Structure 1
Amino acid sequence: EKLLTESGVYGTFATFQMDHDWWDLPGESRVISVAEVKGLVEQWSGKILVESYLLRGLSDHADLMFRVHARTLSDTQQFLSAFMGTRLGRHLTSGGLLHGVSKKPTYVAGFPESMKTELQVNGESGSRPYAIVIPIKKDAEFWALDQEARTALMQEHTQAALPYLKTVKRKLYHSTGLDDVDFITYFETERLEDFHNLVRALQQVKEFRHNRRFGHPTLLGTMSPLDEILEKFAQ
């Protein structure tokens, strides 16, 4: 649990879709397949954290998503090849896959002391909250800017977001060089209209036009314990 907050921690987003031929299995065999998976997760639960999301019926061409924290992607690599080896995995098509390490804040030091104070707040306490993942690539312009400039952009970014700081938990991952994006943004909320308004707000700052890629995909789901998701496939 000191992974959801600490730096140097790699964070991975893996998406899967269940095959059609899965339903041509006897119902029990599916239940046994579930147990295989459930056992594997616990077997790794010492080295890594694993969270589950139901994308089925919210995200196109996706049923399930894992969010995996680990000090090294090697450990994460092993976990996923193993998961895809199970009887259940063998009927899963690997969808999206994105890595990004959590880093120490980069621009907040140049913010007003009154703005830093409010950023210690992160999000509401919630159970079965919605979850959103949005990958981002900046344009070349953005990197060419100087520190003072970007600091001012992020400061305007932060400002527009302040009224949604309680109803929206947030986490940021640094993905450059591990895949075709710069950032992976991750959000939890019970109030989706709030998240919608939060995004339309951020769409109006300067920073935004420098997003060469925004979404594609925009993953929407529900946070749920793993077994409950698997239950749906074993009936």
Structure 2
Amino acid sequence: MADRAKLLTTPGVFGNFSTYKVRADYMKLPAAERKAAAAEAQMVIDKHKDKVIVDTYLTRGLGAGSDYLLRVHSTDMAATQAFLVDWRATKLGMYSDVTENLVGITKALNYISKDKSPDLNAGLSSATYSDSAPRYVIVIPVKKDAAWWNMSDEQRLKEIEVHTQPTLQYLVNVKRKLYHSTGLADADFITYFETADLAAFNNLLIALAKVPENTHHVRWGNPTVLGTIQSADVLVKTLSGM
């Protein structure tokens, strides 16, 4: 059976990110049909609970790319697909147009490992989030240029150490997670963040804009997906006028 804490903290897990706009004729449906949408959403999540985990987020009003985001994990990529196929059959899903959908895999540390960069690795492992419960999500797709990948392992390691040094301080108020996507999407990475403090988040990304690694980005957003963390019930009720 699928265990949430394990799926969120181990290598080899597929993360499937999808954003949707609600079609204009959804709100033209009868109120009873929309009232029932929330229970249909919970049933489809529950149907797939032995294979996948699902998180929901409200993006309407915080960007033009979408109205909501789904983050789905499984050790089986096709299982994420099957969940999303069934989601699209729900009442809300049927009235949802997909606007972005990126997949990636979690991996062991390539750079800031105990073996390769022990001091920074220690700071990474010892950090503790100490703020209020996160309220916001940010997803940033990232793609690096050919020049980056053609640099040596040693050159890249140095640039990732420079990425890490000024950002460790933000682990008190930003949670991060990295997925790897080269060959599976038009991105090298999907980056995922949770925070209560968007002022801090803006400062964190400014810090990263200022390092030489940033000279290699050909995608660093587009979209930058900003949303609020919501339960599935609240999300679907909100989008259904319920």
TM range (shorter): over 0.9
Q: Does 1:163 align with 2:175?
A: no
CA distance in 2, matches of 1:12, 1:204: 30
Tell me if the contact between 2:19 and 2:66 (Cα under 8 Å) persists in the aligned partners.
yes
Confirm or deny: 8 A CA contact 1:137 1:181 kept in the other structure. Answer: yes
Structure 2 runs not aligned, ≥5 long:
none
- Further displaced range: 120-129 or 32-41: 120-129
Verify the 8 A CA contact 1:176 1:183 in the aligned structure 2.
yes
For the residue of structure 2 that corresponds to 1:199, the secondary structure is: helix
In the other structure, the counterpart of 1:113 is 118
Q: What is the CA–CA distance in structure 1 between the aligned matches of 2:175 and 2:9, rounded to whole Å? A: 12
The whole-number CA distance in structure 2 between the counterparts of 1:164 and 1:3 is: 24
May I ask how many residue pairs the two structures share in their alignment? 235
Corresponding position of 2:223: 217
Query: How big is the shift at 1:87?
Result: 2.0
Among candidates 132, 143, 151, match of residue 145 of structure 1: 151
Q: Give 1:19-30 correspondences, 5 Å limit.
A: 19-30=23-34
8 Å CA contact 2:92, 2:236 repeated in 1: no
Kept in 2: contact 1:111–1:155 (CA 8 A) = no
The aligned residue for residue 196 of structure 2 is 190
Could you tell me whether the CA contact under 8 Å between 1:17 and 1:94 is conserved in 2?
yes
Equivalences for 1:17-96 in 2 at 5 Å? 17-96=21-100
Q: 1:31 to 1:79 in 2, by over 3 A?
A: same
Question: After the TM superposition, which parts of structure 1 deviate over 6 Å for at least 4 consecutive aligned residues?
Answer: none
Describe the shift of the 1:72–1:201 C-alpha distance in structure 2 as closer, same or farther (beyond 3 A): same
* C-alpha deviation, 1:200, in angstroms: 0.6
Deviations 1:143-197 (A, max 9, x none): 1111110000000000121221211110000011111000001111111111101
Cα distance change, pair 166–128 in 1 and its aligned pair in 2 (3 A): closer
Unaligned runs of 5+ in 1: none
The corresponding residue for 2:105 is: 101
Cα-to-partner distance string for 1:48-105 (whole Å, 9 max, x where unaligned): 1100111011121311111000111100111111111122211111121000100000
Answer yes or no: is the 8 Å Cα contact 1:58–1:221 preserved in 2: yes
Q: CA deviation at 1:20?
A: 0.8
CA distance in 2 between counterparts of 1:61 and 1:219 reads 8
> SS of the residue aligned with 2:32?
helix
Q: In structure 1, how many angstroms separate the alpha carbons of the residues matched to 2:81 and 2:131? A: 31
Cα distance change, pair 148–80 in 1 and its aligned pair in 2 (3 A): same
CA deviations on 1:199-229 (whole Å, 9 max, x unpaired) are 1111111111101111100000111111011
- Pairwise CA distance, 1:230: 1.2
> How big is the shift at 1:113?
3.0
Distance 1:126 1:25 in 2: 38
CA distance in 2, matches of 1:125, 1:3: 24
**C-alpha separation in 1, matches of 2:189 and 2:128:** 19
After TM superposition, the score normalised by the length of structure 2 is 0.93
Given that 1:128 and 1:224 are in contact with CA atoms closer than 8 Å, whether structure 2 keeps it comes out as no
Distance (whole Å) between structure 2 residues aligned to residue 125 and residue 52 of structure 1: 21
RMSD: 1.4
| Separation of aligned partners in 2, 1:215 and 1:131 | 13
Identity over aligned pairs, percent: 40
What amino acid is the match of 2:49? Answer: S
Tell me how far 1:117 sits from its aligned partner. 1.2
> Match of 2:165, SS?
helix
> Contact between 1:137 and 1:183, CA under 8 Å: does it hold in 2?
yes
Contact 2:38/2:232 (<8 A) preserved:
no
Q: 1:114 Cα shift?
A: 2.7
